[PDB]
Each structure stands twice: as C-alpha cells, then as structure tokens.
Design a protein around this ligand. Structure first.
Ligand SMILES: [Mg+2]
Length: 278
C-alpha cells in the first residue's frame, strides 16, 4: 500500500487564449496512476469542505482519500505561476495514521509540507520519496518563484527517491546538465534521483537508466512527472522490477498519460500493458 501526502489544487491554465479549470495536484496525478496500476492507494490532502466534491473522481479511481479540513483550497494559475490561495500546511498530527510500504511527499509549494516532517515519516515507513516542487517552488507575493532548498543536505539523506524536473534540478545544483544535476543531488544523500525532461525520464542510483516518452499532446504534459514517479514507485517498490525495468515501465505509463489531458485513465491500461504487464 502507498500513501500520497499533498494539496489538491484548483489549477487555472490560460493556454492559446482559453482559461481552463483543472481539479488536480501532484497527489491526484500520482494516486490515480498507483491505484489504476493495482496498488492500494491512499491520499492525505487539505481543502475546504465545499471543494471536496471537485475531487470526488479520486474515489472513482479506487483512491482512499482523507480530506482534512482547511479554511482555503490551494489554487495555482499558470508563463508565470501564482499561488492564488494556499490550504493549511500538513502537521506531524496528520502523519499519525500513516499506512503501507511507501509514502510519497508531493507538495505544490514550499511550506505546504514542512521539511522537518521528513525525519518523522522516515521512522513510519520502509520507502519514503518526495517531489522537489514542494521544496524549491516558493510563494513570494503570490508569484511561485524557484529558490534553492537550503536544508536539502540534511533531508535528502532520509529519501529513498527524489523527483525533479529540469528547472527544479538546475535550481538545486546551478547547472542545466540534468545528468550532472543527478550526480550532485545524489551526493546530497538521496538514494535514487528520478528526473523528467523534454520527452524522457532519467533515473540515477549511482548508474544512469534512461527511457524516452513516445507520445505527447497539446495539454498532455501537466501531471506527467507525477504520473512517472507513481509508475516508477509501483514498478520498483511494489512489483519488484529492477531500477532499469521500473524506468522503462515508468516511461511507458507516462507516454500513454501524455496522449490526453488530466490523470491516467482506466482505458490507458490496455495501451500501457503492451500485452506484457497485465
Ligand atoms: Mg513536477
């Protein structure tokens, strides 16, 4: 069983003159991927009671959701990203009822998931991962700006896996060489780096494993990193795939998700399986 901890988000996308509302977030994209791939999945999130109905589709995809109360729901408009509203941060109290083999920390903004909750979770679970977005994307007068993670060298040592994209990796290392940024971030003590970039995934554990995304679509990109991380965690943690095979599996799942907007769909499983997995 896996638990995703993170804010659901009212995503506002202004693309090609059209304003789109998406009820998403890292945890929505990751949890639907793990659940559809047949791993018992739980989400711990915060939003207003009024906004809970906007995220009902999580339960439709088999995800057990703890909708903790918040006076506000997180809302992000996207190019510059603005935190319109922020739900309440997670607390040590929220970790009390943590269940399963794995927990993935998938925050949207620095301060949503306090870094000093990482050593608390470390003691509670066998496989702990986090998404860099929640530690390098910092609200400054609403504007979400990229800032280095000052305490990365203390907390990365507690993580079995750390997810970055190109912009997050460069924020953490000062280089736009994603492979070199993988070497630098692993030297901070994270056992596995999973990096997504234009049309591919790079996984580093001391050795590099690369797989390309073979599909993409106008609005298929958002959540593809969250999807890739969840697919890798299912492959590697739950299905006992080699790091190499989990990387290829992760890329295959992400590719099918990138054919359409929103999270992985049950109808995507046929395309993903390739008459091999399920
Ligand atoms: Mg991401």
């Amino acid at each position: 069983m896996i638990t995703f901890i993170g804010h659901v988000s009212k995503d506002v996308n202004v693309v090609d003159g059209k304003r789109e509302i998406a009820y998403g977030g890292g945890v929505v994209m990751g949890a639907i991927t793990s659940s559809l791939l047949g791993v018992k999945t739980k989400v711990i999130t915060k939003c207003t009671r009024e906004d809970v109905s906007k995220f009902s589709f999580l339960r439709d995809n088999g995800v057990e959701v703890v909708f903790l109360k918040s006076p506000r729901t997180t809302s992000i408009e996207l190019r510059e990203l603005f935190l319109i509203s922020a739900a309440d941060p997670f607390t040590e109290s929220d970790l009390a009822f943590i269940e399963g083999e794995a927990v993935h920390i998938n925050p949207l903004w620095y301060g949503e998931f306090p870094e000093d909750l990482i050593p608390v979770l470390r003691r509670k679970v066998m496989f702990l991962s986090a998404d860099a977005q929640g530690f390098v994307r910092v609200p400054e007068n609403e504007k979400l700006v990229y800032r280095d993670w000052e305490m990365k060298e203390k907390y990365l040592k507690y993580l079995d896996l750390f997810k970055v994209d190109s912009r997050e990796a460069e924020t953490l290392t000062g280089t736009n060489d994603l492979r070199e940024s993988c070497r630098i971030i692993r030297s901070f003590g994270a056992k596995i780096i999973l990096a997504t970039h234009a049309s591919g995934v790079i996984v580093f554990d001391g050795n590099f494993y690369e797989a390309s995304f073979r599909s993409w679509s106008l609005e298929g990109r958002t959540g593809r990193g969250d999807t890739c991380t969840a697919a890798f965690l299912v492959g590697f943690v739950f299905k006992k795939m080699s790091i190499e095979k989990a990387t290829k599996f992760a890329a295959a799942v992400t590719s099918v998700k990138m054919r359409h907007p929103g999270p992985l769909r049950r109808e995507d499983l046929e395309a993903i399986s390739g008459d091999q997995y399920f």
